[PDB]
């Protein structure tokens, strides 16, 4: 019932650095310069209800 530390502190205590943490809890959107200024790597389903 102690004070409410943030939730990433325990993820760090488990020896997780920031990079693989964000790899754990999220998905990935890919951008690249394919001759026009960082084209987007589009997915069909993710653009629903937007």
């Amino acid at each position: 019932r102690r004070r409410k530390l943030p939730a990433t502190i325990i993820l760090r205590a488990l020896n997780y650095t920031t990079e693989q943490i964000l790899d754990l809890f999220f998905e990935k959107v890919i951008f690249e310069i394919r001759d026009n200024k960082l084209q987007m790597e589009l997915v069909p389903e993710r653009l629903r209800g937007e």
Binding site: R1, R2, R3, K4
Partner: protein
């Protein structure tokens, strides 16, 4: 501070839960007690705290609201604020040095010299040595126990001759009162080889203290009469009074000063002459001067204070020792701090009875005295109905032979079995095991619907029922009637012989003196009246009061 936002948060929401209180606390508040006290602060003002249509009421307040808010703002900085006795004492006991590793013998030597200074100080007093020769003569003349004066020395008969020798030396010291100084030094060096009983020594010291008090009280009668009423000047009274102390010049040749203050002491003139003669007379009552015995008991109080200011240090260390020892009885029906206090008192007891002469370490012996005194105070003041200490020891040995007889005999002890294994007569063991149980609290929450307690069902066995008071007033009326049916002889003599409508019932002789007749006539008259009352028409109404 951050708790301010917490109070305003609780006031916004109208409540405060244990989660938010655990969050918003000062982080290094490690003290759960001040935690409880600060939540009791935030609640005692209102808002009310919980742990998870909350429309009851507010209950408070514009006066205590800012009071508790002020206490919170202060307590945000309350760093060392445990504020309870058991922890405050531990703090102020560990804070003091544990400077005791066979420095006890150095402290003991300090006490040894300090207690010999008081010895020599008293022994330089003439009238006390007179008292000692007195008690040698009385204790050997059968006034008390034969060793009721001395605690040994560095033998009844050679000791009596020793004391006759000391008596001769001191009485010639008195004979040769300069010449008296050398003989009083003789006195001191010849008594310096002896050792008195500490009770006689105690009366000695208390008599010196009464000397000091009376001499200072005559000091007050001298000074306050002019030095505190007429405003007698300070430094001139100093350089004249102390500095002369004997002659008439300090007062009789000072009334002739005609100063602004010597024109003020003609009022107390004869009074301060009484004080002067009392000075010289008390010098006789003590034998020697006021200055002499005064500085005597002064240096004696120096030595006594020197001794006491070391028992302080060793009781500091050994009181850490007592908090060590006491913790074996935390669940004996006595408070922990009271245990530690009894241990401290016993520790002073043992410190005044600790001896380096056996070369024994302090702890093992002071802990002896401390365990003694602590078990003593437990047996004394741990139970409301005080059973004496021996009864507690008996119930303890009964209990100790009860666990044994249980683990062995399987089933349970019994008074037959216990009177077998123990040496008691099978019935006082009955009463012992009847005695041991504690009075249940009268506020025990009963297993009822109304939140009832055990104190609500304890009936009353002394009250007389109003059918039994209206069955006594009816009897008083009936007897007043049935006595009215009678001559003044019988009526008066029966109201007087018994307590009827009157004060104390008199004997026969008092009734006779009221009637001027001898007791046997009174007996005949009362028997006549009772015979007359025994028959019906005078008995039917009284008799119905007898349901037997």
């Amino acid at each position: 501070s951050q708790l301010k936002l917490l109070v305003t948060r609780g006031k916004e929401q109208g409540y405060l839960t244990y989660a938010e209180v655990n969050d918003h606390l000062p982080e290094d508040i490690v003290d759960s007690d001040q935690i409880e006290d600060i939540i009791q602060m935030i609640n005692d003002m209102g808002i009310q705290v919980m742990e998870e249509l909350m429309l009851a009421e507010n209950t408070a307040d514009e006066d205590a609201a800012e009071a508790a808010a002020q206490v919170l703002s202060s307590v945000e900085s309350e760093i060392g604020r445990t504020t309870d006795p058991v922890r405050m004492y531990m703090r102020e006991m560990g804070t003091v040095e544990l400077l005791t590793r066979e420095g006890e013998i150095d402290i003991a030597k300090r006490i040894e010299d300090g207690i010999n200074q008081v010895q020599c100080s008293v022994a330089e007093y003439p009238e006390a040595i007179t008292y000692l020769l007195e008690q040698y003569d009385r204790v050997e003349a059968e006034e008390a126990r034969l060793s009721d004066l001395i605690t040994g020395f560095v033998d009844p008969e050679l000791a009596r001759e020793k004391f006759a020798e000391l008596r001769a030396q001191y009485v010639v010291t008195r004979d040769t009162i300069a010449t008296a100084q050398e003989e009083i030094l003789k006195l001191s060096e010849v008594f310096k080889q002896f050792r008195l009983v500490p009770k006689q020594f105690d009366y000695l010291v208390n008599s010196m203290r009464v000397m000091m008090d009376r001499v200072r009280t005559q000091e007050r009668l001298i000074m306050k009469l002019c030095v505190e009423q007429c405003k007698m000047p300070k430094k001139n009274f100093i350089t004249l009074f102390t500095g002369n102390e004997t002659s008439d010049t300090w007062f009789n040749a000072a009334i002739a000063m005609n100063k602004p203050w010597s024109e003020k002491l003609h009022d107390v003139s004869e009074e301060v002459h009484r004080a002067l003669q009392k000075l010289q007379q008390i010098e006789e009552e003590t034998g020697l001067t006021i200055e002499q015995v005064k500085d005597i008991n002064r240096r004696m109080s120096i030595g006594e204070a020197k001794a006491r200011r070391a028992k302080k240090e060793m009781v500091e260390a050994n009181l850490r020792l007592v908090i060590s020892i006491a913790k074996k009885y935390t669940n004996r029906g006595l408070q922990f701090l009271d245990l530690i206090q009894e241990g401290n008192i016993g520790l002073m007891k043992a410190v005044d009875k600790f001896e380096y002469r056996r070369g024994y370490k302090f702890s093992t012996y002071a802990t002896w005295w401390i365990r003694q005194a602590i078990t003593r105070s437990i047996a004394d003041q741990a139970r409301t109905i005080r059973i004496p200490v021996h009864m507690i020891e008996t119930i303890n040995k009964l209990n100790r032979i009860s666990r044994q007889m249980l683990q062995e005999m399987g089933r349970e002890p019994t008074p037959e079995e216990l009177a077998e294994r123990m040496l008691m007569p099978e019935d006082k063991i009955r009463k012992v095991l009847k005695i041991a149980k504690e009075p249940i609290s009268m506020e025990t929450p009963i297993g009822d619907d109304e939140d009832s307690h055990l104190g609500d069902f304890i009936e009353d066995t002394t009250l007389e029922l109003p059918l039994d008071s209206a069955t006594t007033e009816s009897l008083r009326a009936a007897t007043h009637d049935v006595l009215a049916g009678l001559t003044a002889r019988e009526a008066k003599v029966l109201r007087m012989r018994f307590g009827i409508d009157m004060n104390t019932d008199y004997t026969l002789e008092e009734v006779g003196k009221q009637f001027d007749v001898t007791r046997e006539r009174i007996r005949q008259i009362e028997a006549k009246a009772l015979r007359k009352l025994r028959h019906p028409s005078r008995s039917e109404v009284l008799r119905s009061f007898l349901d037997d």
